[PDB]
Design a protein around this nucleic acid. Structure first.
Ligand SMILES: [K+]
Ligand SMILES: [K+]
Ligand SMILES: [K+]
Ligand SMILES: [K+]
Ligand SMILES: [K+]
Ligand SMILES: [K+]
Ligand SMILES: [K+]
Ligand SMILES: [Mg+2]
Ligand SMILES: [Mg+2]
Ligand SMILES: [Mg+2]
Ligand SMILES: [Mg+2]
Ligand SMILES: [Mg+2]
Ligand SMILES: [Mg+2]
Ligand SMILES: [Mg+2]
Ligand SMILES: [Mg+2]
Ligand SMILES: [Mg+2]
Ligand SMILES: [Mg+2]
Ligand SMILES: [Mg+2]
Ligand SMILES: [Mg+2]
Ligand SMILES: [Mg+2]
Ligand SMILES: [Mg+2]
Ligand SMILES: [Mg+2]
Ligand SMILES: [Mg+2]
Ligand SMILES: [Mg+2]
Ligand SMILES: [Mg+2]
Ligand SMILES: [Zn+2]
Lengths: 177, 84, 59, 183, 115, 60
RNA sequence: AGGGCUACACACGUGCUACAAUGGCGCAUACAAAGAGAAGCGACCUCGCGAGAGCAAGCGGACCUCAUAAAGUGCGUCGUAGUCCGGAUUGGAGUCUGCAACUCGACUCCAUGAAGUCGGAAUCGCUAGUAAUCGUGGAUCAGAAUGCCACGGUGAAUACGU
RNA sequence: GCGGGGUGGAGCAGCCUGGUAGCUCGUCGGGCUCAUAACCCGAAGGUCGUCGGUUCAAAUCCGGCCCCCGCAACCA
RNA sequence: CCUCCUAAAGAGUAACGGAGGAGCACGAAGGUUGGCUAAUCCUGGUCGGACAUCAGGAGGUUAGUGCAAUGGCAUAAGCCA
């Protein structure tokens, strides 16, 4: 909760000054952080999805929900209902803790980290990024990485525009470039 | 490459032509056969036509070309490719 | 009409040659015009222009 | 017709004679502009005569069409088929030199060497005009590489060039051309 | 056992292990171990954390991994953009240093492309 | 949170070679030793020609 | 004078280097022959990581120089991996010759680290100081050998028989 | 009117029963040979007549259109 | 045998009239209770591409209904437990 308290004690005031918000309720707030580990190759093997679920669980601190195909698609040879991924949604204290870990430990361990793109904002204030190697999270053990797994991280925010979204994330010392 | 103790190489005729062109500010391309002369810093901004063996290819000297020989910017063999 | 063409086609034989290529003597001579080169390799390489132009001029 | 050609000849002669005096003035007055002016007049007149020459050369009806070149080996046998391959190489390379585009429609190859026959499509300006005179039988005299004794042998191969004629328009029968009888 | 953003082997001797860093070979590895005051024959696993920190400090004095890669990429790009002979050879994927091109050059040209 | 289905999530100490020590909840049981962190990473810290070459090298 | 003879979808011939442990690397330490040298061989010493540079002996030579032979042997390590195998390729920095190394020289240093894990049909050489393997010298030559010519080190297998 | 067909260059499979293209010759490369054939060792080449539909997905199932085949076309 | 039109605004209504389907399926795909809401497109995002999974937006049933067509269906008859 270091980061949540930091929000409530610094970020709120800074953003109030920056955007001249009338009410504190107008300040952008990190609503949730969704980590998704869609595994296409689980069509051939179910244990791949299980191992990826374990990895996402270690990174998130939570048991992941196994997402399955919305509709059958020929191109990837998937039928509707087959599990093609695993997701975790982080809210509250678990979310703020993950944000701290991502900012202060994992992003530093990103190989050749030169700065995260500020163009990635969705157009409504949310921010999605991609991790290529789960090894960037200290929880995963390099001595047991059977396969190079990645994921994508979405920070969904109450901000009404990309400018407010980037201001909030920057105020949290997010390493943009 | 040429030993640093010897200094860079430039054909005296080309050196004189480059000096005269720089001083006079002329914009006519300077034709040369001296593919072996180095591109000096003073050369930047000039159009020098280096002989490719059958014609003088025009080359506008830039700062990144300094140190390279003039012949490196005038290909001598033309290869469209087999079964073009 | 095609058969008439095929019957006007000269036999590929000893009597009739528009051009002779003696490669043991380095001589190529067109019998119609008279153009006679000695650089047989150029004509083999495709320097037929001398013979072709001579024929067109002689029409 | 007579007039046109005669006038062009007379004007060519007289205009060249005129350019002579104009060039004399160019150099004499040392007017570099007038030297370039004389060059301009002469260049155009040169091109004019070249046009007349082009009309003399390519006077055939279909001279402008794309052409087909057929090469067929004759009396030499294996040697003739080798000679045909040589002729094919020669003509293809000449076509490249002239800038025409070539394709091999069909090619019957020899059992031991060379080609029995080959058809080549030549596409280009006045291709049939440039290649029409090459039609004929070509004689080759060399020590045959296919004779054990290395004897001097004569072999023959034929080139036939024919123009690419447009496909005939098919015509349907005018009902006024038919008489129908029922019985 | 993590240096310069990558993990180094731990069961190997240090001199060999450091070579796993892009930009460090045997000579630079000997230099690093010497400046850190660690025997070249000691396995990476058999090192205290302070020794690994000293190794990281020593590696910091060179250009390695992504920094080196982007320098190399920039140089090749500069040649290709200058349009020098070397750059054109780089573009067309042919040998750049004046090697023969009719019989050999498979390393640059890749596997044979049959007609 | 549903009990018995989630990983074990307890507080651990993570120390970077630069010096920063963070007490953070994590799934890993042991304490973490970090080769890098936001406090010391070159990008976070912000710590991360031809004519000159010719002139200097040739001394003409 | 500049370019080309050095090109490059591709096919073949003849070579070099390998695919490792009968080996790789590091340290130490034995044993040759033959040859060349004056616009030459160049010692020593000093500087440079190195290629080399500066100064400078000797030698037209059984005298001086090129010029420590290498394989080997002893110790240590690697422990079987595309590897401490392999060294192609490429980036950067240099040296020397030479008016002049861009096309298109050789060599050095740092980085890089490809194919290749013993090769289908087929095919080659060799009967003894031979094959195999290991070094060395020479001509041509300003510079530019895996080629050629020559010299030694270690040193086999097998030949029933037609 | 009723039946069949149309797939590497050629001849045939694969369709029924949707997921996947095969055989023989031919072509190309390397061998053997003085050379060619034969022979031996390797390669490549068809998005399935043409459109459309249906389907997550079509050589395959459906409908047109084109070509080719058969039959049928009678009392009159 | 079922659906639409012909069929003339109740039912019914013919032709070798114009168009399509059925000869089953499901112990859940039936009952109830509780809950939920689509297609499609846009933007952002590891491999990931026209198309997998994730986030937001636009849209509002243009979806869905085990299978033809018609009439229905949001209180859903559609989806999950
Ligand atoms: K070359
Ligand atoms: K060789
Ligand atoms: K050179
Ligand atoms: K390696
Ligand atoms: K030499
Ligand atoms: K009705
Ligand atoms: K139910
Ligand atoms: Mg070379
Ligand atoms: Mg040569
Ligand atoms: Mg090695
Ligand atoms: Mg010598
Ligand atoms: Mg090296
Ligand atoms: Mg391999
Ligand atoms: Mg092995
Ligand atoms: Mg004998
Ligand atoms: Mg040897
Ligand atoms: Mg020997
Ligand atoms: Mg199919
Ligand atoms: Mg009614
Ligand atoms: Mg009524
Ligand atoms: Mg009635
Ligand atoms: Mg009735
Ligand atoms: Mg139902
Ligand atoms: Mg209900
Ligand atoms: Mg129901
Ligand atoms: Zn730190």
């Amino acid at each position: 909760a270091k980061l949540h308290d930091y929000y409530k004690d610094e970020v709120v005031k800074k953003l109030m000054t920056e955007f001249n918000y009338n009410s504190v309720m107008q300040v952008p707030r990190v609503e949730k952080i969704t980590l998704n580990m869609g595994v296409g190759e689980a069509i051939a093997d179910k244990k791949l999805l299980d191992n990826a679920a374990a990895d996402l669980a270690a990174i998130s601190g939570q048991k992941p929900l196994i997402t399955k195909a919305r509709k059958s698609v020929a191109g990837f040879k998937i039928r509707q209902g087959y599990p093609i991924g695993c997701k975790v949604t982080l809210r509250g204290e678990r979310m703020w803790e993950f944000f701290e870990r991502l900012i202060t430990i994992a992003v530093p361990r990103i190989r050749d980290f030169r700065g995260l793109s500020a163009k990635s904002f969705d157009g409504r204030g949310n921010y999605s990024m991609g991790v290529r190697e789960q090894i960037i999270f200290p929880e995963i053990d390099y001595d047991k990485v059977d396969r190079v797994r990645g994921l994508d991280i979405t920070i969904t925010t109450t901000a009404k525009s990309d400018e407010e979204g980037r201001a909030l994330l920057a105020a949290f010392d997010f390493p943009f470039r | 490459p040429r030993s640093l103790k010897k200094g860079p190489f430039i054909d005296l005729h080309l050196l004189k032509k480059v000096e005269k062109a720089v001083e006079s500010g002329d914009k006519k391309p300077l034709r040369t056969w001296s593919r072996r002369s180095t591109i000096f810093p003073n050369m930047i901004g000039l159009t020098i036509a280096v002989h490719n063996g059958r014609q003088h290819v025009p080359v506008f000297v830039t700062d990144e070309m300094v140190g390279h020989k003039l012949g490196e910017f005038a290909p001598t063999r033309t290869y469209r490719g087999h079964a073009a | 009409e095609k058969q008439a063409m095929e019957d006007n086609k000269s036999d590929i034989g000893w009597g009739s040659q528009i051009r002779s290529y003696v490669l043991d003597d380095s001589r190529i001579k067109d019998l119609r015009t008279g153009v006679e080169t000695r650089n047989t390799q150029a004509v083999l390489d495709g320097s037929l222009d001398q013979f072709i132009e001579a024929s067109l001029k002689a029409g | 017709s007579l007039e046109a050609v005669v006038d062009t000849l007379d004007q060519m002669k007289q205009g060249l004679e005129d350019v002579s005096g104009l060039l004399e003035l160019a150099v004499e007055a040392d007017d570099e502009e007038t030297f370039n002016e004389a060059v301009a007049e002469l260049d155009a007149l040169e091109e004019k005569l070249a046009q007349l020459e082009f009309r003399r050369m390519f006077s055939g009806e279909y001279d402008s069409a794309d052409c087909y070149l057929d090469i067929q080996a004759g009396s030499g046998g294996t040697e003739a088929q080798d000679w045909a391959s040589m002729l094919e190489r020669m003509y293809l390379r000449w076509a490249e030199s002239r800038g025409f585009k070539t394709e091999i429609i069909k090619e019957s190859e020899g059992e031991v060497a060379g080609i029995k026959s080959v058809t080549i499509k030549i596409s280009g300006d006045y291709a049939y005009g440039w290649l029409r005179t090459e039609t004929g039988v070509h004689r080759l005299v060399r020590k045959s590489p296919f004779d054990s004794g290395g004897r001097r042998h004569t072999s023959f191969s034929s080139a036939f060039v024919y123009p690419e004629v447009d496909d005939d328009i098919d015509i349907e029968i005018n009902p006024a051309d038919l008489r129908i009888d029922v019985y | 056992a993590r240096i310069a953003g990558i993990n180094i082997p731990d069961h190997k001797h240090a001199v060999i292990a450091l070579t796993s860093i892009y930009g460090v070979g045997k000579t630079r590895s000997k230099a690093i171990l010497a400046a850190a005051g660690i025997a070249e024959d000691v396995k990476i696993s058999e090192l205290s954390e302070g020794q690994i920190d000293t190794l990281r400090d020593e590696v910091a004095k060179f250009v390695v991994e992504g920094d080196l890669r982007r320098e190399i990429s920039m140089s090749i790009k500069r040649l290709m953009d200058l349009g020098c002979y070397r750059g054109l050879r780089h573009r067309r994927g042919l040998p750049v240093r004046g090697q023969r091109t009719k019989t050999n050059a498979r390393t640059r040209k890749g596997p044979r492309k049959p007609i | 949170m549903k009990k018995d289905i989630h990983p074990k999530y307890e507080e651990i100490t993570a120390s970077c070679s630069c010096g920063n020590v963070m007490k953070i909840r994590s799934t890993v049981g042991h304490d973490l030793n970090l080769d890098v962190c936001s406090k010391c990473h070159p990008f976070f810290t912000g710590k991360q020609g031809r004519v000159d070459r010719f002139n200097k090298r040739f001394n003409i």
